[PDB]
């Protein structure tokens, strides 16, 4: 029944950022031990936690890297966002891509739907985060027939237990309508899945699903920021 | 009734923190922005309703004005003297602007603004344009009063979010601006999740960009909050 | 007479502006005189007519505001633009944002919809100017059922005669098909008139009508120059 | 005229809609003309690009303040002359390049006495207006007896406007549209004119995208243009 | 059949990079000769396979050329990618304009429609790369009436063996659902194949197929730096 799983609040970002050339430099030294000394201080407090940093070079223009943190208060995000952008100098050289907020609540229909990071799962090695917006019709549609469409669209991933999905509410946390994060041992699983699920008649129920981002999780600060263009 | 016939013009001026131009030393910074919003006050033409910290809500916008002026003019005013001539305004840029203008609503008379109505302000705050489909408003009207009145129905659990819909033709690119104004975030994530579930959806057009943020309680909570 | 304004030739721009912050300063005295001057020299020479100068401040993002200029010749409206902008402080210290381009001509079925401008009537205190892009089977449709549309579209402004209209052909003069411009003694009347004007079938053949710019019409240069940022 | 030469002959066409960069040009510009105008002289010589006009686009819209219009046999010789303006005289230092309108000439699909202006050897109009175009989806898979009746529509439409002379040529997989269009008259309003008459054809219902526009007046030389653009 | 070549994993990545003016300048010699030396040792290493570097001068704004490379795993692209970017003069002179990535997979039902690059083909001296989105009901339409539409699709090109054609899914690794690429000894062939590829019913399938970068693709480095702007 996942009744307490599905009861808590727990809200979650995706703060995509993108390197601004030049502003790093090639001295990286103290510019690594202030990030981690930052990331070392949330846990500690223990309000903010942080799912995983990745590396998005070669995804897409614009982005070169994501932090997924989480959340009982918004309100905590935000300022754990803002200390980042305001107090580090990582945070300082970088520009804010883009912003991926959710709020998790149950499924209208399946309570054993849950996101990987409610159920306690270990982060995957890799991930893809994007945006989802459902066709005007959907939540008005006769609810047997949403369910019976949402029972297909699970059944074409069961080839992919190692794929782990995180569908989030996303209203009025931004543009969208839910916020999507698929995480596996290896990146063309996802791809495989994303190919999968275009021949389900969900397909026929959707306005927008993009920016994608898809990358690498790092296992410290100082494997991303080494990477990143001077 | 004298409310439905009130007549108040309402803006919500969203900015962007500059990166690099506010710096570190904000003291003289905070205190002539608070001397700004406290000259409003007492000249009495323009009314905030609120200042919001919108960090972490969308890439591109940091904070958010809400005032209220009788006259379109007195907000113009007050916008640009706040670009003009505070700090703040010369190194912050205006991201986004959604104006508004008080109309009875075409059915329920009843459905007044919180702001019209004086209702104390949100903790919390969501704002957003609406544009209908091009078929709404030839619609037969009692059934866009009957879907209007199912679309209100929906709402029945949250009356703790009160709710703000305005008209915005030809004061920018949309038909209404909206404010939904909660004591917790979750609510308003909540509301609009149900009332996704309404014959009215049928019926949209464009709805983004959403700008949600907390109330502070002074201009100081703001600016040291900013990435400088 | 009636033949001779359907007839007329008459270029109409509306050169919408952006203020730069730090470019204008606090000093605007000689600013303000300058500009006057560059006006009233526009006014002696007779082949630009400056209908209005609008303080678009609040209304959008990215502009600041407006000059509605007329003239029989477009290439005196390129030269009275190209001039303002390389001879004036005020025009090399904005950007210009969007440039709305009309050329009149007579209307389809009604000659007696002649724009204000044309009419000669005193411009209003208030504006709103935006293009419009109608549907694609607007102009194939059967003429008769165009011309009831319209009829009942004209019917359903009745109650807004203080609102004066302009409708002017804007093809190949930019992105759009239409220039229109509504101006009234107070913002509240143009507001309710687009509401008004929903409720009417033309509105099921449109494709696009943003970006509206909407503003005050001051009496003099110096109104404009000193709201502006520095 | 020889239709079958016309019609087989290989032509890339180029517009090139450039952005001055304000405060980049200043108030000395005589050796950026001087400089510009030994560029152009240059290619006449080569004998490989021919620049059929250049265009001041002054009030046209914002973020675009001319533009070049060159035809060459091959489109290599296109990417040489673009990239040597901008990178070896001033005046494409000191400026962005707003949009390009690429295109190859190709016969008609039912009326092979259709050329564009420039295949005739025209002289070229004083004013103009360039856009890209994109069709509905289903217009190609149309009944060809179709597509060509509507396509023989769209041109009575155009019997008042002779003075108009239209250049209509494929831009597939040269950006992002299907045709390039350049329509070249003696004044701005016979261009606006005719634009508004042929919405009343039926081919307008079959049109997915026709933006951005470009409209100006040809200059006689590079110093014309020069001494116009913003400072 | 083609068992192997089927199954074969490679991902595919087109970097296409804009010119920063005024970074390059005139001093060029020695940034050919170190980029030079980075893709030679692109070479040795074995892991990333360049298939070309194209000159996009003058195909559109905001694009001059184009990296297209080959890698068993993504995590080699992005660490190419971001050595480029990082450790060449050229990389940090350059801006990330767009990337188009993409992951080998058989087709749905010709599995002898393979990309040219996996089948070892030279590559072509002129190429078009574009990303596909098809519409919503492309994948849920009868197998039947898709392999009927496909195969038609394909018969349609019969006159063009000299254009190679490599289709290539890009489902989670950026906005799209497809990689293109379309290599010929000449242009014109190119544009001519994409005008007869608009006579099929497929073309009734499709929602999103831009941008397009077309370019030459060059023998050497030194090819590509000379003509960049300074
Ligand atoms: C990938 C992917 C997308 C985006 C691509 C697209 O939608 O095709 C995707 C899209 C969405 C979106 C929006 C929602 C949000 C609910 C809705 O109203 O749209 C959304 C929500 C749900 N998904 Fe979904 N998905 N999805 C999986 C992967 C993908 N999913 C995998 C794998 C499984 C199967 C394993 C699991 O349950 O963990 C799975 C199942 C569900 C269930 C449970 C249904 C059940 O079995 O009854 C719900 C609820
Ligand atoms: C949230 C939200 C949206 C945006 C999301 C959506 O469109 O689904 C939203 C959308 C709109 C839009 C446009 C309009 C403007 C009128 C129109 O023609 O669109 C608009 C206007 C009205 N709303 Fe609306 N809404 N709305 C609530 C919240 C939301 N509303 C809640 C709560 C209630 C419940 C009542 C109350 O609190 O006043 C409620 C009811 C009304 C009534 C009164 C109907 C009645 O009860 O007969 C009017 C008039
Ligand atoms: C506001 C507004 C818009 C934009 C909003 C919308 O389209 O709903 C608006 C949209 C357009 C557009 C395009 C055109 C161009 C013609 C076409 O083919 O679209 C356009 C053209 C016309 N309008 Fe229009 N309008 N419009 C008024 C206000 C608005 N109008 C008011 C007031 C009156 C009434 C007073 C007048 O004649 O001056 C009025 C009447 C006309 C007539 C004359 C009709 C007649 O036979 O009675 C013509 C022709
Ligand atoms: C202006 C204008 C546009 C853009 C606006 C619009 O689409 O309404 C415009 C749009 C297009 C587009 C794409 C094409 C490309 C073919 C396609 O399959 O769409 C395109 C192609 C053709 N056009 Fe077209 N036009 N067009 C003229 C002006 C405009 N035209 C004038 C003038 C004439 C008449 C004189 C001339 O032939 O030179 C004329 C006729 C033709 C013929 C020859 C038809 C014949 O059999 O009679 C062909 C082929
Ligand atoms: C050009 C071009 C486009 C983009 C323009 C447009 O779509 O019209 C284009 C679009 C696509 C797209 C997406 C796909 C991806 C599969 C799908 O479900 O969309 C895609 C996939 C395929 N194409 Fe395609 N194309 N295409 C060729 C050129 C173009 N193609 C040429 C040449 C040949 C023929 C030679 C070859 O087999 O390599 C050819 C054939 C195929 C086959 C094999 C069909 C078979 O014969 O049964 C498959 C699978």
């Given at each position: 029944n996942f009744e307490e799983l599905n009861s808590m609040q727990r809200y979650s970002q995706?703060?995509?950022?993108?390197?601004?050339?030049g502003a790093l430099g090639s001295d990286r030294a103290e510019?690594?031990?202030?990030?981690?000394?930052?990331?070392?201080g949330l846990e500690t407090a223990g309000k903010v936690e942080v799912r995983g940093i990745y590396?998005?070079?070669?995804?897409?223009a614009e982005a070169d890297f994501m932090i997924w943190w989480i959340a009982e208060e918004f309100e905590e995000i935000q300022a754990?966002?803002?200390?980042?952008?305001?107090?580090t100098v990582l945070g300082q050289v970088s520009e804010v891509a883009w912003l991926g907020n959710s709020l998790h609540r149950p499924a209208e229909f399946n309570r054993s739907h849950l996101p990987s990071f409610i159920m306690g799962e270990i982060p995957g090695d890799w991930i893809?985060?994007?945006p989802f917006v459902r066709?005007?019709?959907?939540?008005?549609?006769?609810?047997?027939?949403?369910?019976?469409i949402l029972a297909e669209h699970g059944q074409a991933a069961r080839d992919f237990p190692d794929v782990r999905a995180n569908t989030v509410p996303a209203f009025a946390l931004g543009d969208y309508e839910w916020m999507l994060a698929f995480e596996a041992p290896r990146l063309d699983?996802?791809?495989?899945?994303?190919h999968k699920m275009r021949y389900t008649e969900a397909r026929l129920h959707v306005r927008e699903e993009t920016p994608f981002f898809t990358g690498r999780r790092v296992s410290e600060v100082s494997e991303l920021?080494?990477?990143?263009?001077?």
């Open positions: 995706f703060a995509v950022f993108r390197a601004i050339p510019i690594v031990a202030q990030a981690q000394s930052f990331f070392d590396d998005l070079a070669g995804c897409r754990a966002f803002a200390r980042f952008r305001r107090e893809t985060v994007a066709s005007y019709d959907w939540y008005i549609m006769d609810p047997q027939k949403r369910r019976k699983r996802i791809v495989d899945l994303m920021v080494n990477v990143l263009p001077g």
